[PDB]
Design a protein around this ligand. Structure first.
Ligand SMILES: NS(=O)(=O)c1cc2c(cc1Cl)N[C@H]([C@H]1C[C@H]3C=C[C@@H]1C3)NS2(=O)=O
Ligand SMILES: NS(=O)(=O)c1cc2c(cc1Cl)N[C@H]([C@H]1C[C@H]3C=C[C@@H]1C3)NS2(=O)=O
Ligand SMILES: NS(=O)(=O)c1cc2c(cc1Cl)N[C@H]([C@H]1C[C@H]3C=C[C@@H]1C3)NS2(=O)=O
Ligand SMILES: NS(=O)(=O)c1cc2c(cc1Cl)N[C@H]([C@H]1C[C@H]3C=C[C@@H]1C3)NS2(=O)=O
Ligand SMILES: N[C@@H](CCC(=O)O)C(=O)O
Ligand SMILES: N[C@@H](CCC(=O)O)C(=O)O
Ligand SMILES: N[C@@H](CCC(=O)O)C(=O)O
Ligand SMILES: N[C@@H](CCC(=O)O)C(=O)O
Lengths: 270, 260, 260, 270
């Protein structure tokens, strides 16, 4: 019996290859998630096909409807079997699906456009207007937003920290909307914002995007928290413990670190 | 009914206070693990009793007899219900106990005394004039033993063919041996202990290089226990509330008895 | 009986003199290969006639038809007896022809125009803004195609998925393309040609990095020929006498039409 | 049928392991030659046992006796089947045994003791009394010699170059004898010579010894010639072409370069 794997187009997790027009099946995609699923299938023998969520979201319980979307809705309603994708482990998601041990560390970081270096011994020094998340809430000339139906958005909604509460209040009272539908949307806004907009996203994607052409963005401050990416599993399923042990074995053998170095640091010329 | 908790005496995880001789009850202990246990009890709503394992030991499988001794042995044999202690998550333990979600990330680090001409672990393995070891019955020695990378295999071969006994009984004895060796003994230990040690008196040790792998600490429960899901939910809730970060800052960086 | 020799017109291996229109016979050719052929004939004691292959081609197996074309084809089909030319030694050719002992060591090198921010071949593969190719029907393209190292596999994939045609017919055309590209075309060629080119006019190209592998040039003979052992002995004798080094110095470093 | 492999104790080609007392068979030795023979056996299936020549020599036709010694005598007389060892390909040896294509490049280099650096902007510069082989024959205060029953000795005997002829004449007219029986003997003479003696040996062993403790020797000048190490085979044997293709395949696949980097550059701290 073929199980279905749900994944989102994200770099460098899943990429459409240049010769994907004549290729059909699992050979269309390349990146971290595809070979991670390959290693999962090697460890526990099964046949799998990669699928993309219809709305391309991560998952969030809509207010006053109690309906899950994204990859969470793929697995809760029973139309999916496993989600090998950068899905963040949260409290709300664990109560509806089973999460394996995290296979990747992450954190909430800030994206800003790289400032122009000041020429005037003759050393080049870079100055930036944002150094952490403390002053980001204080200043109002720079607007900040998050990704809709993501872990960061919900985390900001249910955060009782004073600075995080102020950030959430500003996001609620922001016009026009500072939220974005995809990671590429926020990155494009950062690009064509001329330093007027800052994007809140995971540290791994931020680091990857910073080190790719045209190489004009940089990450400021530290991670706002510590979380991780896990493999989702529907509640009361038989794949939970097998994928958990598979993730543990892959982490122990160092395959995850090798894939990390291959898919983030090899092609990081600037 | 009361619930027994097994914890290893490790800093900054559990202190036996400072005037413990005149203290009776649950106030004789303090630390990150004590606070975490209190918060877990508050969330779940059960009476908990903090106890120390009879033999100070994190827990590992014995030699060709399938006996668990230490803190994991205290749980797998039914004498303990929960263990709020810095227990590393690894594949072999998951087969015998239930791990909650990790609450402190970490990795394998190297601590020496005062440019540090040692770079990463690549140079450490090929440099033989300096001795280095791990902690008895932990997770680092198991990771080195069962690794398949060639350089990690070289470290494991150096571990097994080492004279005299390079292994240390406790982390405190390991850092004491580092102090008394005066730059001739590196210690392969996890990160959190390294930041805690390097930020206290006399502040003569520091972490060098990066981390060889990424692991974390979990809450161990007996297989098929009724508290695994509640403790997982409590850990996730505390992580969402930022309480874990608050306690980490309080017991690691708040004091800072050195130049930071 | 006369012996026919097949040689590809390559410098500094074989010149067609300078006033070749008024030259008839064996004096119309000069170079390292001509001198080597003369010395082989002197040692063995046979009449040799220097000829150029009809189609300028080092020789490689054709596509799914098992036909050898070029200099190796000139030998395997019985029309040639010996070939004193810079033919690289590889496994596939050894199955069809007999190679003498190598007389000039070499390796795969990279030649660009005038700090050279390219380092080794590791940076060349991951840098895509600059085009690079090999020589048609040689040995470098075969080595890249049949390699199993991942980075060499990346170079081979770039070779096959390249627009426009990056391959060049002759080495002279390759260096001319390097000249006309003005720092936007690296050439993957063997060493000896690289030192010979970089030391002549206009002296605007240089070798960068190291050598990806080590190979050599041999004397090819038909399978089961009566001259393989004599030519091997002659090559070894010339190597012992230092004559090979003398001719290498004469045709590579003696002239030196640049700043050395 | 088990064939016999003859090899000489040479570093880093063959080393006796520290735990060689309780180990018997092919597990006693470690280095380049042992794993090269392992790869040879993997490529062409056969069972092999490693053996050491009785007199520990390389091979030279004794004058007025026409008797071969070393590994050449192991194979010519029929008491050996293959010689996977650093045996140099020469004209005289090819006429008595079959040689495969070279698997390692080499050259004749000079060993001298590393001179003391002169302190008196405050840069440390090293000066040496020998810069090439041209002035080595001219000066007489520094004595030079070679290894007996080696390729270098015979090459100097049958060299018609003026400088090489002068070097051979000096070696013939040297008292006490400047020749050595083993590589370790010449290295020890260089060590306890205080710059009074120079050793002529292959470039690979010279480079390896220079980069090991106590790291007090250095190689001067360039290689006097270009030669190579091959795999010997008795005349008219059936292993010739198989080992030739095996060497070609191993060279093509890059196993030789990997073994080189493992056995010369990994443990080269100084
Ligand atoms: N900053 S830290 O090392 O004290 C730390 C580290 C971690 C924390 C919380 C803290 Cl405070 N929670 C995460 C957990 C939360 C959810 C996402 C990953 C696991 C499940 N694990 S972690 O990434 O190992
Ligand atoms: N270096 S990294 O971010 O790619 C990374 C991150 C992590 C890895 C492994 C790697 Cl390679 N494994 C751990 C897992 C291993 C065992 C201990 C914690 C979980 C269960 N999770 S993690 O701390 O999220
Ligand atoms: N210096 S050079 O590149 O012109 C050069 C290179 C080589 C020469 C001779 C010269 Cl002059 N002979 C050797 C041969 C001699 C004997 C030892 C190795 C082969 C058989 N091959 S080589 O190492 O490829
Ligand atoms: N870099 S090295 O000295 O270990 C080295 C030296 C040599 C290698 C391979 C290596 Cl890795 N292969 C060549 C062989 C390959 C084919 C071409 C020449 C012989 C037959 N001989 S070599 O030029 O003597
Ligand atoms: N990685 C996030 C989505 C992207 C974001 O919110 O920045 C998640 O799993 O929810
Ligand atoms: N802390 C580890 C022991 C290994 C170490 O600390 O080095 C454990 O809980 O198993
Ligand atoms: N010189 C090689 C051709 C490849 C090259 O020169 O790049 C040969 O003789 O086969
Ligand atoms: N490698 C040499 C022996 C050592 C030497 O002569 O320096 C040979 O094969 O003859």
């Amino acid at each position: 019996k073929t199980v279905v794997v749900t994944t989102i187009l994200e770099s460098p997790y899943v990429m459409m290859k240049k010769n994907h027009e004549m290729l059909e099946g699992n050979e269309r995609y390349e990146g971290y998630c595809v070979d991670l699923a390959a290693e999962i299938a090697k460890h526990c023998g099964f046949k799998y096909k990669l699928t993309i969520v219809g709305d391309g979201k991560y998952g969030a319980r809509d207010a006053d409807t109690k309906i899950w979307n994204g990859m969470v809705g793929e697995l809760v309603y029973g139309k999916a079997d496993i989600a090998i994708a950068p899905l963040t482990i949260t409290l709300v998601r664990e109560e509806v699906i089973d999460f394996s041990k995290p296979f990747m560390s992450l954190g909430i970081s800030i994206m800003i456009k790289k400032p122009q270096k000041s020429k005037p011994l003759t050393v080049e020094r870079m100055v930036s207007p944002i150094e952490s998340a403390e002053d980001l809430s204080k200043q109002t000339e720079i607007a900040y937003g998050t990704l809709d139906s993501g872990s960061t958005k919900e985390f900001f909604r249910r955060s009782k920290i004073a600075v995080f509460d102020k950030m959430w209040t500003y996001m609620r009272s922001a016009e026009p909307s500072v939220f974005v539908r995809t990671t590429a949307e926020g990155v494009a806004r950062v690009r064509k914002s001329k330093g007027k907009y800052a994007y809140l996203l995971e540290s791994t994607m931020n680091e990857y995007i910073e080190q790719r052409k045209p190489c004009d963005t940089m990450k400021v401050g530290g991670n706002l928290d510590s979380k991780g990416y896990g493999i989702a599993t529907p509640k009361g399923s038989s794949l939970g413990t097998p994928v958990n042990l598979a993730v543990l074995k892959l982490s122990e053998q160092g395959v995850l670190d090798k894939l990390k170095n291959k898919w983030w640091y090899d092609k990081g010329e600037c």
